[model samples]
Target: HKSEVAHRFKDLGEENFKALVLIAFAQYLQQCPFEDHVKLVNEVTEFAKTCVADESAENCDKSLHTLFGDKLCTVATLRETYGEMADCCAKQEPERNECFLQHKDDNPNLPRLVRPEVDVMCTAFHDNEETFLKKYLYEIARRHPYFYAPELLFFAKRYKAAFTECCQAADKAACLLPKLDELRDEGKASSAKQRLKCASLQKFGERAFKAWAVARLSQRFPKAEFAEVSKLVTDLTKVHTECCHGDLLECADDRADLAKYICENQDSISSKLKECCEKPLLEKSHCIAEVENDEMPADLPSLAADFVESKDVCKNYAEAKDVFLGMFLYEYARRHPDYSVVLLLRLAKTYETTLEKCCAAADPHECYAKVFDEFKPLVEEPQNLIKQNCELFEQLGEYKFQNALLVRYTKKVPQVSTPTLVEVSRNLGKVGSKCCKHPEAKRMPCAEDYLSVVLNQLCVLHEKTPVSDRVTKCCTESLVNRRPCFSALEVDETYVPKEFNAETFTFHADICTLSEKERQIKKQTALVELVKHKPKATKEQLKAVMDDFAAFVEKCCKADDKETCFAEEGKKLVAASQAALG
Candidate 1:
């Protein structure tokens, strides 16, 4: 009989014919819920006869529309049920409109029909309903029109126990989801309005899972912000979805289950979390917490907290070494969260060199942990330990030197190439070798000062001079003005006549260098000049001025035009200096 009907409507194509048949059956059912099978067949059979008996498509259209209009089509079934509450007359259009509006607010079915399938599906959860509404809905969706999928899902959710009983599968929800999807897709291509019959359950499912996971994480880690947890939750949801074949509830039943899932899939989950957390805070505005430190976590235990907190600190302290170090700790923590405290202590002491040495080791965290255990904590105060082994901490010089070298050569080296640069390079190597080689020697007090000169003096000249004659011209100009001119020179190993020992290399020209005392006086003088405008400035005010001046100098001194850079900077420094000393 089904095949005979399919053959009869073959000209309309298979899906359209099916849609029309479902429409007719649904109409009959809506008008007569207790109708017999014979009456249902006869009603549709009459409608089909009307459809095919007409030679013209127009006549067929009129007959189908008339039948749907009189019988209450399924698409409009819920609407008509609500409409019945109003005193509308089918024959009078104006009276019908007025009556429909009168009962619009009073209709119970009105509310249910307007709701999305996801929400509607949630409502059919009554266990003892007289009829298994879900079973019938499922049957309609599966055996007749695909448009009934969402409606059936509502029923399925209500009678889940009944579904399992009838379908003999616990994953009835999962099984129904695909069927809904198949119908939605098929409906889209066949009928312009069929897609609307069932909501795109896939998107709704994703939204539901995302919301559920986000809420779960929020409840679990109440101390942390949503943004910090969202990425991790999203990743967990994705992994669970994939592994369980979209059985989200099965994959993540509770907090413990989610935690286990996350731990089990660390690599994949961590990668996704890292990417999300690393994004700029504004991009994830839904996140309640802002990443204050720009630093990454050095270990897993700290990662959750540090990933958010470090961003704030790192962003605020935007400096070369500070930034680099923060990033280093973040990455290090992630790579070796399980590293022993002893190894961590040693690595912290001689950060750069240890990174260079142990970073590339087969198990760097373990290797460093061994070295760390050798240096037992002598004092209760962690910082006091630093004082006990100052020599070990000095091992940080290697990292400092490496960083300094990068800044000096890549950033500070003048664009100009000159013979003076040749000597400068040679001298730098000697200084670097001394600084990095001696772990017992005191930390270089002049490291920042040296860096300042390279950036301010050499970088300035490099920017001013042309590449062709930059070295010669900038070096000559720097020397003529008694500024650090070595950065202007182009040099290789052969540029220097012979290799000089540390003592001889130390004898090279100061190149506009200043001692600690001399630098203090210089800074103090600048401050004194800055404070001139605020004669009655108290020492408190002066202190504030000095602090303000220091910040300005930090920014200006790094500029190419030290004079022009220091112009406004000098104003602030002078006013502040005068205010302090007055």
Candidate 2:
């Protein structure tokens, strides 16, 4: 029967082939619910292993061929069922992996890969894995919620050890992601009008995975030894602000607080991170790179929150690091590809380094995939000169030096073969000096160390040691230009309605809140609180507060009009304060 299915597809006539492809895509979309169900189960199991002992739960069996299953095909229905499954997993907790396994077992009648028998056969030459992979690869490669769905099938045939050891097992995860992306591109390829909405599920899943990874990693190492781990958490929070359910990325103060927490609780947290987080960091990196160009906002908050709630703070923070780095790398690669070797190398190096420091001992397949994806033929290879050096890539100096080298080789240094280390370093230093003087006029900070390099450049050029204005301006103009502006709010208090409206109100001028000497003091107190929590409340909250305050002033103005006595009285109060100052 499976062979017949394959032959039928192989011999598809032109008209029939198109029809079958449509049907297959529709079928895939329809089965999104089932995929989501499996994902929920995996998420629960992953969380449960850390919080409590793993156990099994009740599994619901259903069929796509049945009417009930057909109705579940609608995206709305699929989403609702997904939510329900996730909620169910939350309730079932430690034993929830069973519920998913049970479902997979019960769905034997669901359409198997067209060539199911060959899927089991080891041909090495055949595209059996490729076919099944194309069907679901995007989700896996992008680290979707159902990333481990293939694992369910793989684990059924083999135990955890085999699943972890085999290259085939890893391929399952790698293949689908690229394919899902291709399908997504194809979905937009034609203008055949009826549009199927793209879902943020994949992005959301990646964030969630990253959140858990951040928490796990941060929990594993001591403060002195785990600076990279700590930086990872901070970086995640910085780049993916919305991952925490808020738009405001952690303020400078919030970052300092998190860093302090790691410093204080390193021992207990380090052990927890090391034991619980075994997933590849590069998966997060690659997914991030693959998806940044799309208009989806990865559901980082859900991811971040899942880590925080599913595990302790450290584990959650550690996972968050992976998420943030992935997102950062993705955005960098997508937006800065024109920057030549600096852009490509830094991303490659940072990925390699971060993985080495965090995930080297855990999974190499992930390591190779992530690093290779970034550096692989990104505008013709530059001969792997850095040898995948993350430290060299992590700084602006490195990027500058590399770009200068590129420029020199193409221009002045062409004939020189194998320059000495000191000569190279000396030349690079000169390049750095020339490069730093005019950032806009010179090489692009287009690599993994791109952000750090820009920031460090800013620090060197500044009295206070922060990102330089030129670097800041260029980075803003280029990388993150879509950020919402505070001034987007129309600030007229005269009759325009309304974030807030107080129909009637009055105000008496009081010098009590701020005395003569206490003026800056009171301002400082408010500033402290304001700066303390960011990426949580930045301008939006501030704007709302100001709007409300203005509304009260408007109400007072309206009252002043209604009761003429108040209008003149306020004017007199203003004059009195001026007179007092005089």
Candidate 3:
């Protein structure tokens, strides 16, 4: 058993063991990590042999990955232990389940810095870093074709998320849940790893990405007390998980009772934490110093070294803590770009902590303001990029023009091209022809070319429809009704030959030949017949036809975009025309 435990424990250096423990604890009772199941398996053994059902231990181990994997594990301990021993213990210590229930309700209100609530703090950490934590890191590493894309995307996401998280942590903690929820919703809409990356990005977006990186490096090193500090993080988180959904009254007795037997009765907040974490080490230290005893070096990196090399004090504890926290996050982010929201939140918190310490020392508000004065142009760069891209697309003269005026006013560029006034006019002529096609079939084919094609057809039919007859009929009707003819009919035409010769044919002659005045009269007769045969005709039959045609043209042309239609340095021209004959 010892050899097996050693194999799993050996690969993680003593410095990382505590971190591993914290990681394991958070992932347990949540779908956060795979190995948390192993720890659960071990925890059950202790609960089993203490005058409890031995069989319950086996069930606990099997169910750790099985039941909890499919469903959320409540802090409520499983009560249905079978066999004689388990039944008696449950009857005696009836509060075990109640204890778990009580802690669950009050977990959120507990303080962290004073008591060092690991689970609550890391919940914030995970909440903040949710965007970048890939579900399966190794799988992404194996499958991605462009190695850097996944990693870069991961880091960038974390950087963004951390940036936002840090700013909020300093300004307000309430924003944390809403921000995390937004990230969670975003993740649920994507795959496990994609959701993870999104969460990471959100965390990075919360803070100063550069400072966070520096802080991260200070966290992992040969000269540091990483393992000891890590255990504090781990123990805090473990207790937090145990207490999250459990009743507080239940834990008061258990933790208060266990404290005496657990180790030295260190009563102060900081000493209490140190005692609980160090007790395991102290007990094993005497028997095997090399195996269990490890200490954080006092010679760790000092941020103050660059400022004042003189020791006003032995060391600045606050400054050292900041440096360690910062470096730890930086290193962790570097290794796991697809880090969890929980991890990112921790880093963001670390950054906030470090920044407060640094700012307290540096008094940098004035310096930062001065630096901003020199860099205002850079701040305005992205908005300009959007404007310039909008203009570039306009110059290309594709389907439609972009509204330069709108862009100038709103800083929002068009995603689609705007159709110019001339294009609208051309399309309207085609639309009229299709709508007037046989009159019975009112619907057009819904093609891009349909509007233009039908409009030209309408124009061709218009000239031939006999304007003279339409005008006489319209005038006669107005006279009969004692109303004036508000509209008039006008027709112009040119001719086109059976065949056109490049050498002999001019556009004017071609138009005249194509005019076909005799055929136009027949089309006019057809129009008058339909109107006269109608159930009712409003005003003159011919005048109504011309008016309907003009209305159709106006509808088809719509509007034009100047930004897209005009030349460089050109001002937009507003223009419109109405077809009228009187």
lDDT score for residue 167 of model 1: 46
Worst 10 residues of 2 by lDDT: 190-199
The digit string of per-residue lDDT tens for model 3 on 141-174 reads 2232122222223333543564356444644335
lDDT value, residue 575 of candidate 1: 50
- Tens digits of lDDT, candidate 1, 102-149: 432311221122323532443443442323452354234323322332
Worst lDDT run of 10 residues, candidate 3, spans: 569-578
Please list the residue runs of candidate 2 whose C-alpha ends up more than 4 Å from where it truly belongs after superposition: 1-253, 268-582
Candidate 1's C-alpha runs over 4 A off are 1-31, 34-41, 56-63, 72-89, 92-135, 138-582
At residue 416, candidate 1 shows an lDDT of 27
- Residues 1-582 of candidate 2 have per-residue lDDT tens digits of 212222322333333323233222223343453355344333433332322221231221121122122323333554454444333243333244333323321122344333222224323314444333333432222222212222222222232232224335446535433443444333322111111001121333444434333333322232222345446555554433432221111222243344445434535333333222332321223222222112222332322232112333233325665544543443333333334423433453455365545443464434334344444454333223222222343463653444323323222212222222123333344434443443331233322223233322322233243223332343333111111111022322222211211112223333233453343323222222222212123344444443443454345545534345344554554344223322
**lDDT against the true structure, each candidate:** 0.38, 0.33, 0.31
